[PDB]
Design a protein around this ligand. Structure first.
Ligand SMILES: Cc1ncc(COP(=O)(O)O)c(CN)c1O
Ligand SMILES: Cc1ncc(COP(=O)(O)O)c(CN)c1O
Lengths: 396, 396
């Protein structure tokens, strides 16, 4: 009985997946990508990293087990890059980070850490979200709530439905708040707004989650750990989950990490000690290839300088490309102020296609959306601009 | 509240850990290692793999997300090497394997796969075990039982306490039975013995777990997937968990995989589909560096031939070294037939040190055991033989 009467299906990420090249033709693109891509639409390897995969093929003297907390060089710049550089919060000794098989893999380690030590029973998320989010958050029974910004039409943040939809539950409760701007809505609380809700993370109670994948890829690097920081010399307890998978040409090989923080180097050596057990049951100690090629890039000024331009570029085209989609419709389409997209950050963003508009594209079209209205501006190109600009019209 | 009144400590694997080089001196060795090591006691990188880490530094064209089931070349030889080569069970289409962050990381994915689909509430293990075993098996509430061989004195398998301690519970129940010979007792049911209990996995009910790390490293490669197979054209349902981490100079970077098998390519496309969700919440898709450097070694006759001698050698010294410890005591010690060790396989094996004998070594000795009587014959050398042969006497 691993056999009969099961049940079965689909992460709404197959959502185009294969069915995309399926039928064979000018497939615009499954704008609904899990990734960046160039004015070529190749998800490259980078260099900076390649530049280091040599360095470790050169001196990788062994390959013995790794501690269940990876490596804190990976850890210290993780640290340094989150909280930021100078904070003696860093040398307050009051946050630790283990290595973790990136993104979604650090949030689940958060979940059983959190079933224990923590007397929590839930996490309120955000509507719309990341659909693996309510899933790696159901792990320790823990059910998710849906707080509520992005109320649409001016596709812009309902501070309102939020503080409100938010304020709503219990002290011992967990919110989840991703770094800058969003999946599926490269949206956001500005400074004063981040600023606004922390006075509220505070007395209300809460305690922040903080999914931070995409970090400084959707922002110049900097408004990013402000997003977070602002909510940091403000708190007392928090849990940040990160992932270098995107921002580094790193996935495949699971990279980022989970960081615990408290007021006491006593309280955090402690909570962390149990956390180091959440892990010990999953994978027992990290996918090491990753950490290394990230500690290295990160601890090399020559190498860190190759990487940082690579990232910078990578931004160029989501700041830049984002614009494009819009003038082209300013020159065809012509049914709305598609401005939003242009300045509404990240490589993700939803649109006015009541699904049905989008079941449509797939068609004797060959456009591939995410039946939520979400497109990876990342799959949008110089070459596609055009047709994809014209796919849509007839769709309205 | 991620802060006060927690709880906290120690996987009984720190058990020497650091405290070993601690005090500074002729440290014999923390015979209680998590790994192999040479007549040097360096846990090398190999070559064969190194030979391929070049091949992928050469053609690693991208590095996009990996499917949540890794790669089935990794998968097909995983397959082929488990069940074995020829079985059209293979082309019965009736077992699938996902990639997984090795060993302990495939057994936990087994656990939540198994909470679902499966209406199971427990796994009976083996006494003595692998202490992360009852831990990555408590995940989905699921508590572990302790079945019971290795009754001691002739340190050899109690078929008896077993079939018996075994037969004991319920149909819908899970046993766990590691591949050949053991941690901490490179022990074992011979062929007829493996042979014996399957007639019993069968009508009794059960359904095998099968932790298979160490595979063909403790045996010439071959009696190994016999261990398993014997129990294979015999069953109907099973769950095998593997790890190339040892046998390949691969850990650090989490490698092996979890394999589901059924009678129907219908039933197994199905159970697997849900299994592909256990995972989707943990790490979301595998530590890819691993699979690749293992599919490659495995699909290259030139390269597979470098690796297979590397493994062969690697055996040489557990067949060979195992002997050694014994004649040396045949020439000093002289208080028992320490034969057992010599032929009682793997790189692990327990001894007649009521702990206390071993709290002892640590001493104005500098020997480091595992306070269970377990020593990694793997840490035993030409050079150490000697002193370590003489550490013990005074211990008795
Ligand atoms: C909000 C969010 N969280 C977590 C992840 C996890 O991704 P990864 O594990 O590769 O970083 C993603 C992936 N894009 C994401 O969008
Ligand atoms: C019985 C057993 N099971 C699982 C593991 C997991 O190890 P790994 O994840 O590196 O293969 C080990 C490690 N030696 C083990 O001994």
């Amino acid at each position: 009985m691993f056999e009969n009467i099961t049940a079965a299906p689909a992460d709404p990420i197959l959502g185009l997946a294969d069915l995309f090249r399926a039928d064979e033709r000018p497939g615009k693109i499954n704008l609904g990508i899990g990734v960046y891509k160039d004015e070529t639409g190749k998800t490259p390897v980078l260099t900076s990293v390649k530049k280091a995969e040599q360095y470790l093929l050169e001196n990788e003297t062994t390959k013995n087990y790794l501690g269940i907390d990876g490596i804190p060089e990976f850890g210290r710049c993780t640290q340094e890059l989150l909280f930021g550089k100078g904070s003696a919060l860093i040398n307050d000794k009051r946050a630790r980070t283990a290595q973790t098989p990136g993104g979604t893999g650090a949030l689940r380690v958060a979940a059983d850490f959190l079933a224990k030590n923590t007397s929590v029973k839930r996490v309120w998320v955000s509507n719309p979200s990341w659909p693996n989010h309510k899933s790696v958050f159901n792990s320790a029974g823990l059910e998710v709530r849906e707080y509520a910004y992005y109320d649409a039409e001016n596709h812009t943040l309902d501070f309102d439905a939020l503080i409100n939809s938010l304020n709503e539950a219990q002290a011992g409760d967990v919110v989840l708040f991703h770094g800058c701007c969003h999946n599926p809505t490269g949206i956001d609380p500005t400074l004063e707004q981040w600023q606004t809700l922390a006075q509220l993370s505070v007395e209300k109670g809460w305690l922040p989650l903080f999914d931070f994948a995409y970090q400084g890829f959707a922002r110049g690097l900097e408004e990013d750990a402000e997003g977070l920081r602002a909510f940091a010399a403000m708190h007392k307890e928090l849990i940040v989950a990160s992932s270098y998978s995107a921002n580094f040409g790193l996935y495949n090989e699971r990279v980022g990490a989970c960081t615990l923080v408290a007021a006491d180097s006593e309280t955090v050596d402690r909570a962390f000690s149990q956390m180091k057990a959440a892990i010990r049951a999953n994978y027992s100690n990290p996918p090491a290839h990753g950490a290394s090629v990230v500690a290295t890039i990160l601890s090399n000024d020559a190498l860190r300088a190759i990487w940082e331009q690579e990232l910078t570029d990578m931004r160029q085209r989501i700041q830049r490309m984002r614009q494009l989609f819009v003038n082209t419709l300013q020159e065809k389409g012509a049914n709305r102020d598609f401005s939003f997209i242009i300045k509404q950050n990240g490589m993700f963003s939803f649109s006015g296609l009541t699904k049905e508009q989008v079941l449509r594209l797939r068609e004797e079209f060959g456009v591939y959306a995410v039946a939520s209205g979400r497109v990876n501006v990342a799959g949008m190109t110089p070459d596609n601009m055009a047709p994809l600009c014209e796919a849509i019209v007839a769709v309205l």
